[PDB]
Amino acid sequence: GSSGSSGDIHQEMDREELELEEVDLYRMNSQDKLGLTVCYRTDDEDDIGIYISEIDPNSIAAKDGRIREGDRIIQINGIEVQNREEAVALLTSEENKNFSLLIARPELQLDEGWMDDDSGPSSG
Protein backbone atom coordinates (compact mmCIF):
# COMPACT_ATOMS: atom_id res chain seq x y z
CA GLY A 1 0.00 0.00 0.00
CA SER A 2 0.89 3.68 -0.02
CA SER A 3 0.22 5.68 3.12
CA GLY A 4 0.18 9.31 2.03
CA SER A 5 -2.79 11.16 0.59
CA SER A 6 -2.87 14.94 0.71
CA GLY A 7 -4.71 16.49 -2.22
CA ASP A 8 -6.81 14.79 -4.88
CA ILE A 9 -6.63 16.39 -8.30
CA HIS A 10 -10.07 15.26 -9.38
CA GLN A 11 -11.01 11.62 -8.98
CA GLU A 12 -14.63 10.63 -9.54
CA MET A 13 -16.72 9.06 -12.27
CA ASP A 14 -20.39 9.91 -11.93
CA ARG A 15 -23.19 11.28 -14.08
CA GLU A 16 -22.92 14.88 -15.22
CA GLU A 17 -25.72 15.79 -12.84
CA LEU A 18 -25.72 13.20 -10.08
CA GLU A 19 -24.01 13.78 -6.76
CA LEU A 20 -21.95 11.72 -4.35
CA GLU A 21 -21.87 11.49 -0.57
CA GLU A 22 -18.91 10.32 1.48
CA VAL A 23 -20.24 8.32 4.40
CA ASP A 24 -17.77 7.28 7.08
CA LEU A 25 -18.35 4.30 9.34
CA TYR A 26 -16.76 2.70 12.38
CA ARG A 27 -16.05 -0.84 13.50
CA MET A 28 -15.49 -0.63 17.23
CA ASN A 29 -15.48 -4.41 17.01
CA SER A 30 -14.75 -6.57 13.99
CA GLN A 31 -17.77 -8.48 15.25
CA ASP A 32 -19.70 -5.65 13.63
CA LYS A 33 -20.75 -6.13 10.03
CA LEU A 34 -21.50 -3.42 7.49
CA GLY A 35 -24.83 -5.13 6.97
CA LEU A 36 -24.96 -3.91 3.39
CA THR A 37 -25.16 -6.39 0.53
CA VAL A 38 -24.10 -5.59 -3.01
CA CYS A 39 -25.14 -6.84 -6.43
CA TYR A 40 -24.30 -6.34 -10.09
CA ARG A 41 -26.37 -4.96 -12.94
CA THR A 42 -24.16 -4.61 -15.99
CA ASP A 43 -26.48 -4.26 -18.96
CA ASP A 44 -23.83 -1.83 -20.14
CA GLU A 45 -20.60 -2.33 -22.04
CA ASP A 46 -19.45 1.13 -21.03
CA ASP A 47 -19.18 0.27 -17.36
CA ILE A 48 -21.16 -1.92 -14.98
CA GLY A 49 -21.50 -0.45 -11.51
CA ILE A 50 -21.73 -1.88 -8.02
CA TYR A 51 -24.99 -1.20 -6.22
CA ILE A 52 -26.51 -2.01 -2.85
CA SER A 53 -28.79 -5.02 -3.08
CA GLU A 54 -29.78 -5.17 0.57
CA ILE A 55 -29.28 -2.99 3.62
CA ASP A 56 -29.88 -4.24 7.14
CA PRO A 57 -31.73 -1.81 9.41
CA ASN A 58 -29.56 -2.93 12.30
CA SER A 59 -26.02 -2.66 11.00
CA ILE A 60 -22.98 -0.43 11.25
CA ALA A 61 -24.26 1.42 8.20
CA ALA A 62 -27.92 1.29 9.16
CA LYS A 63 -26.84 2.71 12.50
CA ASP A 64 -24.74 5.39 10.85
CA GLY A 65 -23.99 4.67 7.21
CA ARG A 66 -26.98 6.48 5.76
CA ILE A 67 -26.41 4.13 2.85
CA ARG A 68 -29.54 2.33 1.71
CA GLU A 69 -30.86 -0.17 -0.80
CA GLY A 70 -30.23 0.99 -4.34
CA ASP A 71 -27.07 2.97 -3.72
CA ARG A 72 -24.42 3.02 -6.42
CA ILE A 73 -21.01 2.60 -4.82
CA ILE A 74 -18.25 4.60 -6.46
CA GLN A 75 -15.33 4.21 -4.10
CA ILE A 76 -14.55 2.52 -0.80
CA ASN A 77 -12.50 4.58 1.63
CA GLY A 78 -11.33 6.43 -1.46
CA ILE A 79 -10.58 3.40 -3.61
CA GLU A 80 -11.89 2.78 -7.11
CA VAL A 81 -13.63 -0.58 -7.11
CA GLN A 82 -13.87 -2.56 -10.33
CA ASN A 83 -15.49 -5.77 -9.14
CA ARG A 84 -18.37 -6.87 -6.94
CA GLU A 85 -16.32 -9.22 -4.78
CA GLU A 86 -13.81 -6.46 -4.17
CA ALA A 87 -16.64 -4.12 -3.27
CA VAL A 88 -17.34 -6.60 -0.51
CA ALA A 89 -13.80 -7.82 0.09
CA LEU A 90 -12.78 -4.25 0.83
CA LEU A 91 -15.70 -4.01 3.23
CA THR A 92 -14.29 -7.20 4.69
CA SER A 93 -10.81 -5.89 5.40
CA GLU A 94 -9.28 -6.78 8.74
CA GLU A 95 -7.37 -3.51 8.76
CA ASN A 96 -9.65 -0.71 7.63
CA LYS A 97 -11.57 0.52 10.65
CA ASN A 98 -13.19 3.65 9.26
CA PHE A 99 -15.14 2.46 6.24
CA SER A 100 -15.83 5.51 4.11
CA LEU A 101 -17.97 4.21 1.27
CA LEU A 102 -19.25 6.41 -1.53
CA ILE A 103 -22.71 6.52 -3.05
CA ALA A 104 -24.43 8.39 -5.85
CA ARG A 105 -27.25 10.53 -4.52
CA PRO A 106 -29.49 12.81 -6.59
CA GLU A 107 -29.82 16.48 -5.71
CA LEU A 108 -33.00 18.52 -5.53
CA GLN A 109 -35.00 15.73 -7.12
CA LEU A 110 -38.60 16.14 -8.22
CA ASP A 111 -41.12 17.36 -5.68
CA GLU A 112 -43.13 14.36 -4.54
CA GLY A 113 -43.32 14.05 -0.78
CA TRP A 114 -46.34 15.00 1.30
CA MET A 115 -45.60 12.63 4.15
CA ASP A 116 -46.36 13.53 7.75
CA ASP A 117 -43.09 12.39 9.26
CA ASP A 118 -39.81 13.90 10.40
CA SER A 119 -37.96 13.64 7.10
CA GLY A 120 -36.75 16.05 4.45
CA PRO A 121 -33.03 16.61 3.90
CA SER A 122 -32.01 19.85 2.23
CA SER A 123 -28.80 21.25 0.78
CA GLY A 124 -26.71 24.05 2.24
Swiss-Prot record:
Record PTM text: Auto-ubiquitinated.
Disulfide bonds: none
Cell compartments where the protein resides: Synapse; Cytoplasm
Residues where Phosphoserine is found: 30
Tissue specificity as recorded in UniProt: Widely expressed, including in the heart, skeletal muscle and liver and, at lower levels, in the brain, colon, small intestine, placenta and lung. Down-regulated in ovarian serous papillary tumors.
Domain called PDZ: residue spans: 22-106
Function (record text): E3 ubiquitin-protein ligase. Plays an important role in regulating the surface level of MUSK on myotubes. Mediates the ubiquitination of MUSK, promoting its endocytosis and lysosomal degradation. Might contribute to terminal myogenic differentiation.
Quaternary structure, from the entry: Interacts with NLGN1 and EFNB2. Interacts with UBE2D2 and with MUSK via the first PDZ domain.
Domain comment as written in the entry: The RING-type zinc finger domain is required for E3 ligase activity.
The protein's name: E3 ubiquitin-protein ligase PDZRN3
